[PDB]
Design a protein around this nucleic acid. Structure first.
Ligand SMILES: [Mg+2]
Ligand SMILES: [Mg+2]
Ligand SMILES: [Mg+2]
Ligand SMILES: [Mg+2]
Ligand SMILES: [Mg+2]
Ligand SMILES: [Mg+2]
Ligand SMILES: [Mg+2]
Ligand SMILES: [Mg+2]
Ligand SMILES: [Mg+2]
Ligand SMILES: [Mg+2]
Ligand SMILES: [Mg+2]
Ligand SMILES: [Mg+2]
Ligand SMILES: [Mg+2]
Ligand SMILES: [Mg+2]
Ligand SMILES: [Mg+2]
Ligand SMILES: [Mg+2]
Ligand SMILES: [Mg+2]
Ligand SMILES: [Mg+2]
Ligand SMILES: [Mg+2]
Ligand SMILES: [Mg+2]
Ligand SMILES: [Mg+2]
Ligand SMILES: [Mg+2]
Ligand SMILES: [Mg+2]
Ligand SMILES: [Mg+2]
Ligand SMILES: [Mg+2]
Ligand SMILES: [Mg+2]
Lengths: 73, 155, 119, 168
RNA sequence: AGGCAAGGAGGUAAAAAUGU
RNA sequence: GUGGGAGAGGGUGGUGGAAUUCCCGGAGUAGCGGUGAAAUGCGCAGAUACCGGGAGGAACGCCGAUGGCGAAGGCAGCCACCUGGUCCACCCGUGACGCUGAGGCGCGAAAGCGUGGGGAGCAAACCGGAUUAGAUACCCGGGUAGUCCACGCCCUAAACGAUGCGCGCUAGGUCUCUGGGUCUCCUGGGGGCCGAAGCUAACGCGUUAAGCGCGCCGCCUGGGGAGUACGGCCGCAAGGCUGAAACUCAAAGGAAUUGACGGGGGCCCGCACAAGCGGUGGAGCAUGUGGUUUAAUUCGAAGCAACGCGAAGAACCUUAC
């Protein structure tokens, strides 16, 4: 049912739209270059959507990973 | 079977020595239900062992048992269409029983004349690390290595 | 007769056959092992045991070229990809990391009608 | 079928045959191996049966491939044309009969041998007169495309015939 | 360590006309 | 109007990787691929798998929803531009300007066709293989159109919430998205689920009504015949829209409910199988039957649940032949 910690509750004050702020945005990406669900971030829906959009933008730029590789497994 | 776990019968321990394993072995040896004939046979075998290989005739038996014991066994299962020889682990009691059975078979699958003597010989062989029962055990083990294939079909 | 001691271990895993390639750190392969290589043909070709066998064979081949320092990458999934991995771990080859890199399209073309019905 | 290559050979003196058929003699196995290494090829034990084992400096894999190809050819000139069956009935009407006939014709054209069998059911007592008649009619219809390999044979609750193509 | 679930897997599910 | 906001709304111009195929380059070898099994199929001219680069065309994984949008069909990478709808707060302006909508004009998935392009995958048709009683099919190997784009044309659909649009009224809750607020609770607009009344053939519905009403429009008057014929119109064609009747039958239906059934599932059990010991079959005989032979082999019993059965006593008797 998802509840270990949340990526909104572990992270403090940050603007969502700024894709350049990459390491703060590196926390909402998975271990593989994949987006974590609403039940992992902790956001409201709108916020989540915005975040997703920002991530996409970043990807288009290149900063954040596009798809990566899981370790151990 | 379906409901309960169908308990193992706890045998009355031996009249001369004092071990249930021995009793079980005696029972296994016994055909037609003649315990006194085959118990006598077992005793004769023991005596023979004592005579030839200068040892107590319980320890030797134990050794033999240990030798013939399987840990990896092979079952039959139909999955998809074809039958696959499935390797799986044995519970101790069952393994012991199997070993006993094998020993009995070996005793009956020998070339010499009298019942006790044959049994004794087989026991000695088992103790050594050869014989018939031991060979069978080895074969079984091998089968649970050429077919460790279909181990993921866990029962 | 070339020799390397190091490299990667690309396990392409399909349900019909799990194929294992071993490569040098550059990405130029030394050997590979498959299912028809362990004799097996048809159904068993993709049975976990076959995969394991293939893995073992590949390891052996690598050893015939001095290889130990082994990075492992799996692609797709077959019956035993995990089994193959296990086999490799067992073999005696320095397993650095086992990494998943499935050739999953970012919503690619139309799949074949078998891999359709998924919606 | 399969042999022993280079390192798998433990027998000491081998007879060394070359890539096309170069007879180098009864030589050392090590020597043979060395020769193979030199030509970018493999010494393969082609006869473990003859005078100090008969061994060939060939591309082993290549040879295997060739053999496989040959085998494939053997099983692709063994003809796909088999026996196609068609189960008729007693009270067979016209259009369906014609369809059946057409099917049979198609099969014949393709190259096949045809199990022509009438399934009986209820009475199977007035059977030969009607069933046999039907069979005869069928045969008549296919006199130029088909030849009667075997005549009516009642086994179970049915009777079978077989028909072969007229000219191969 | 157990309790429920979401996902990813990977196996099972694949073979059937005859009467009084 | 002002002040905001949500949005895969649409269109135009781009671009970003994953993937796939294809080409060159490598390194590398005996098979890959396929399946309930297999077979074609490719591979020594070196394929598969692996890395390097390129060539392209598609389509947007994760986010992703039970979500958001639109009037509907539909719509998803991200950007930019042009632009629709809409939602709210101020209650500021106008002062009934509204609501519907026969016809009309538009839009209208997918396929389809015409014209030019492009074309990677997929893939009707089509050619193979199996599969089978057959295989024109499910399953695999290719493989054309087509899918994609531009311009036109087509106009259907389970174009479904199978619910026309509009407003008002009539308990709540609960989850969701989105807006304002004196923001652990209110108040607006959407999307879901549970329900008061009432309603409904029941199922259900239930502030997003199928409830109460009123407004208007669209159909409907048993089924099949038949969305066919006919004409008419549209269209390059395919067809579409519009739409009968003769006859025919006494039904066609829906809901639910038993029961039965299902190559639906779950939960169970039984010497059911497994685990084990011993047999039968094979040998001989003992018996009972089927068959056949006979003057008659008396009759019955029939898979289980007939076959050391009725017969727990056939030389005669019994005994019926
Ligand atoms: Mg405004
Ligand atoms: Mg190449
Ligand atoms: Mg005012
Ligand atoms: Mg005024
Ligand atoms: Mg209007
Ligand atoms: Mg109109
Ligand atoms: Mg294809
Ligand atoms: Mg065919
Ligand atoms: Mg065909
Ligand atoms: Mg096809
Ligand atoms: Mg076109
Ligand atoms: Mg259209
Ligand atoms: Mg619907
Ligand atoms: Mg719809
Ligand atoms: Mg309708
Ligand atoms: Mg809406
Ligand atoms: Mg609401
Ligand atoms: Mg009520
Ligand atoms: Mg309700
Ligand atoms: Mg409500
Ligand atoms: Mg109603
Ligand atoms: Mg129509
Ligand atoms: Mg007309
Ligand atoms: Mg009904
Ligand atoms: Mg019912
Ligand atoms: Mg049985």
């Amino acid at each position: 049912p998802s509840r270990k910690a949340k990526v909104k509750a572990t992270l403090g004050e940050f603007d969502l739209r700024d894709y350049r702020n990459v390491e703060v945005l590196k926390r909402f990406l998975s271990e593989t270059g994949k987006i974590l669900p609403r039940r992992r971030t902790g956001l409201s829906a709108k916020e989540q959507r915005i975040l997703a959009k920002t991530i996409k933008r970043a990807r288009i730029l290149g900063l954040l990973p596009f798809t990566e590789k899981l370790v151990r497994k | 079977a379906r409901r309960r776990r169908a308990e193992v019968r706890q045998l009355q321990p031996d009249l001369v020595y004092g071990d249930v394993l021995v009793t079980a072995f005696i029972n296994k040896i016994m055909r037609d239900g003649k315990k006194n004939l085959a118990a006598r046979i077992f005793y004769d075998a023991c005596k023979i062992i004592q005579e030839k290989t200068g040892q107590e005739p319980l320890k030797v038996f134990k050794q033999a048992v240990e030798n013939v014991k399987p840990r990896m066994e092979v079952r039959s299962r139909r999955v998809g269409g074809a039958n696959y020889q499935v390797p799986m682990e044995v519970s101790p009691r069952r393994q012991q029983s199997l070993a006993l059975r094998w020993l009995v078979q070996a005793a009956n699958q020998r070339p010499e004349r009298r019942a006790a003597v044959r049994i004794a010989h087989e026991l000695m062989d088992a103790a050594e690390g050869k014989g018939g029962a031991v060979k069978k055990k080895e074969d079984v083990e091998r089968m649970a290595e050429a077919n460790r294939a279909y181990a993921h079909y866990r029962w | 007769k070339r020799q390397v001691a190091s490299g990667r271990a690309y396990i392409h895993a399909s349900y019909n056959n799990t194929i294992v390639t071993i490569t040098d750190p550059d990405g130029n392969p030394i050997t590979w092992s498959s299912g028809g290589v362990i004799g097996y043909k048809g159904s068993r070709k993709g049975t976990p045991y076959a995969a394991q066998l293939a893995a073992l064979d590949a390891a052996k081949k690598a050893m015939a070229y001095g290889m130990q320092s082994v990075d492992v990458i799996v692609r797709g999934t077959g019956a035993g990809r995990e089994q193959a991995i296990r086999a490799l771990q067992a073999s005696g080859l320095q397993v650095k990391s086992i990494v998943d890199d499935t050739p999953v399209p970012h919503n690619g073309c139309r799949p074949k009608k078998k891999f359709r019905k998924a919606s | 079928k399969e042999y022993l290559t280079n390192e798998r050979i433990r027998a000491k003196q081998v007879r060394v045959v070359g890539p096309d058929g170069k007879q180098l003699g009864i030589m050392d196995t090590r020597e043979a191996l060395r020769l193979a290494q030199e030509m970018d090829l493999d010494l393969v034990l082609v006869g473990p049966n003859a005078d100090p084992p008969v061994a060939r400096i060939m591309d082993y894999s290549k040879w295997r491939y060739e053999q496989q190809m040959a085998e494939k050819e053997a099983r692709k000139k063994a003809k796909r044309t088999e026996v196609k069956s068609i189960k008729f009935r007693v009270k067979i009407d016209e259009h369906d009969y014609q369809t059946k006939l057409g099917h049979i014709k198609r099969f014949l054209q393709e190259g096949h041998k045809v199990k022509v069998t009438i399934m009986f059911r209820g009475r199977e007592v007035a059977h030969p007169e009607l069933g046999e008649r039907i069979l005869n009619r069928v045969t008549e219809d296919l006199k130029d495309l088909a030849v009667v390999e075997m005549k009516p044979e009642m086994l179970g609750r049915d009777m079978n015939m077989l028909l072969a193509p007229v000219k191969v």
